[PDB]
Write a protein that binds this ligand. Structure first.
Ligand SMILES: Nc1ncnc2c1ncn2[C@@H]1O[C@H](COP(=O)(O)OS(=O)(=O)O)[C@@H](OP(=O)(O)O)[C@H]1O
Ligand SMILES: O=[N+]([O-])c1ccc(O)cc1
Ligand SMILES: O=[N+]([O-])c1ccc(O)cc1
Length: 289
């Protein structure tokens, strides 16, 4: 059974057993100078930005972006599961320019990305909304260990005992890295508030100037209500064994502030006290609504 196993430590970080088992293949990954790396802590807007990027690369052409599922269009690099998927091999066989997805903490990223000085788009999302999203995701996406109860999962998340390790270190270290490499550091909440502005930031970073009409086309097709019903973007092409959408849909709510529906007031106060202690060494600032 490839599903529901315990995580395995990889250079200090809990990862899926099969990623750990094939780690040398990940660490030796060969990047290319024109790769665009989308880097996120899980549940922070990876699919959203991956769809935006593929739409940009295809000039807002919806049909072209339906050539395959997002997880084939924008391969999840480190995700290797025997009999199921191999992100490294998918990318190895993909023509440039490649869009590459990762959730790896900075210290675990294959060094080829640094050596090739690749452009990277990092997306961060407020921790409270992340942990709620990740809880439901753990339930539906069977490669993860059992999340337990909300209360149990919340504690594991705060302790960094979840797949890809602690959110706090992930966002903080990636933030620091922006001083060394070309990292456009985006926030899920900004994309919610003003998607046009954020996509304009992406275009400037990519050194692309496109017509307003194409920009509006990209905006329309990357909206939650369009993506949620789009089989090429909403993960419903996954086998039920890998992802069971009847448990929780991948495109779940797509808002900011769902944490209010999940956290008890006590859980919130405790989470905030812990958060301030973990995040005061950082100039990083988030909005929770
Ligand atoms: N277009 C658009 N607009 C707004 N929100 C969106 C969009 N697409 C995905 N989502 C929401 O993003 C959450 C999934 O994040 P990820 O794509 O990073 O998940 S994953 O790490 O790639 O598995 C998950 O958030 P929750 O709804 O809070 O669970 C998705 O619903
Ligand atoms: O099989 N799976 O569970 C997968 C496969 C590919 C992917 O990008 C994410 C999950
Ligand atoms: O376990 N999974 O199937 C996953 C996990 C993380 C992710 O971003 C996509 C799929």
């Amino acid at each position: 059974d490839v599903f529901r196993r315990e995580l395995v430590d990889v250079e200090g970080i809990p990862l899926f057993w099969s990623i750990a088992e094939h780690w040398s293949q990940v660490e030796s990954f060969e990047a290319r100078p024109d790769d665009i790396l989308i880097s996120t802590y899980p549940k922070s807007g990876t699919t959203w930005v991956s769809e935006i990027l593929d739409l940009i690369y295809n000039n807002g052409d919806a049909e072209k972006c339906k050539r395959d599922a997002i997880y084939k269009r924008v391969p999840f690099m480190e995700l290797i599961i025997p009999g199921i998927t191999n992100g490294v091999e998918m990318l190895n066989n993909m023509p440039s320019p490649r869009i590459v997805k990762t959730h790896l903490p900075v210290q675990l990223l294959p060094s080829s990305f640094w050596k090739n000085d690749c452009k990277i788009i990092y997306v961060a999302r407020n921790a409270k909304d992340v942990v709620v999203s990740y809880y439901y995701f753990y339930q539906m996406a069977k490669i993860h260990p059992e999340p337990g109860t909300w209360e149990e999962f919340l504690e594991k998340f705060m302790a960094g005992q979840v797949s890809f390790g602690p959110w706090y270190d992930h966002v903080k270290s990636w933030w620091e890295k922006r001083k060394e490499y070309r990292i456009l550091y985006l926030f899920y909440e900004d994309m919610k508030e003003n998607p046009k502005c954020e996509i304009q930031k992406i275009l400037k970073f990519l050194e692309k100037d496109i017509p307003e009409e194409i920009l509006n086309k990209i905006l329309y097709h990357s909206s939650f209500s369009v993506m949620k019903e789009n089989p090429s973007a909403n993960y419903t092409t996954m086998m039920k064994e890998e992802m069971d959408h009847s448990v929780s849909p991948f495109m779940r709510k797509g808002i900011s502030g769902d944490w209010k529906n999940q956290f008890t007031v006590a859980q919130y106060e405790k989470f905030e006290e812990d958060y301030v202690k973990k995040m005061e060494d950082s100039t990083l600032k988030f909005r929770s609504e």
